[PDB]
Amino acid sequence: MRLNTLSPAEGSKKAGKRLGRGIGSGLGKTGGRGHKGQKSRSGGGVRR
RNA sequence: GGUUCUCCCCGAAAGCUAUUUAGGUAGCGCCUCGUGAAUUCAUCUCCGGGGGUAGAGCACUGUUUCGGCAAGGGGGUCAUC
Numbered sequence A: 001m002r003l004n005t006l007s008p009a010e011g012s013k014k015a016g017k018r019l020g021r022g023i024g025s026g027l028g029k030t031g032g033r034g035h036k037g038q039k040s041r042s043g044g045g046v047r048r
Numbered sequence B: 001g002g003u004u005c006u007c008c009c010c011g012a013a014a015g016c017u018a019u020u021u022a023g024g025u026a027g028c029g030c031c032u033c034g035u036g037a038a039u040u041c042a043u044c045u046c047c048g049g050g051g052g053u054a055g056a057g058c059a060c061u062g063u064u065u066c067g068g069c070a071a072g073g074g075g076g077u078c079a080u081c
């Protein structure tokens, strides 16, 4: 127990998705939106 | 139109329905991750079923040719009260 030996529970912290950061990321160009509809646009999508 | 580091595992759709809808979107179908559960599911063999397609046929609804039977047509001639 020193200020540089404390570590979080396992599974307690998970990295966020980061869209549009290359091929390898698995989340490049389109960023998980597919091609070219209303739902791909910034602000795009239909009301409830 | 563009969307910037890496590796591992799985892996579609371009259909149906609706839409001032048709290059948009929503539910379902197909993809993924998780949880739960029945020999649940597949192929083969044997058993039980309904069919009206392929082929065929011409009783029926239609169509078609030839021959006998000819109803009855129509043509001559006299009649034509």
Ligand SMILES: [Mg+2]
Pocket (backbone or CB within 6 Å): A025, A026
């Ligand atoms: Mg990822």
Ligand SMILES: [Mg+2]
Pocket (backbone or CB within 6 Å): A026
């Ligand atoms: Mg990908």
Ligand SMILES: [Mg+2]
Pocket (backbone or CB within 6 Å): none
């Ligand atoms: Mg694009």
Ligand SMILES: [Mg+2]
Pocket (backbone or CB within 6 Å): A035, A036, A037, B023
């Ligand atoms: Mg399109």
Ligand SMILES: [Mg+2]
Pocket (backbone or CB within 6 Å): A033, A034, A035, A036, A037, A038, A039, A040
């Ligand atoms: Mg789309």
Ligand SMILES: [Mg+2]
Pocket (backbone or CB within 6 Å): A042, A043
């Ligand atoms: Mg805008």
Ligand SMILES: [Mg+2]
Pocket (backbone or CB within 6 Å): none
């Ligand atoms: Mg694969």
Ligand SMILES: [Mg+2]
Pocket (backbone or CB within 6 Å): B015
């Ligand atoms: Mg179909």
Ligand SMILES: [Mg+2]
Pocket (backbone or CB within 6 Å): none
């Ligand atoms: Mg209808």
Ligand SMILES: [Mg+2]
Pocket (backbone or CB within 6 Å): none
């Ligand atoms: Mg039968």
Ligand SMILES: [Mg+2]
Pocket (backbone or CB within 6 Å): none
């Ligand atoms: Mg038939």
Ligand SMILES: [Mg+2]
Pocket (backbone or CB within 6 Å): none
């Ligand atoms: Mg036939």
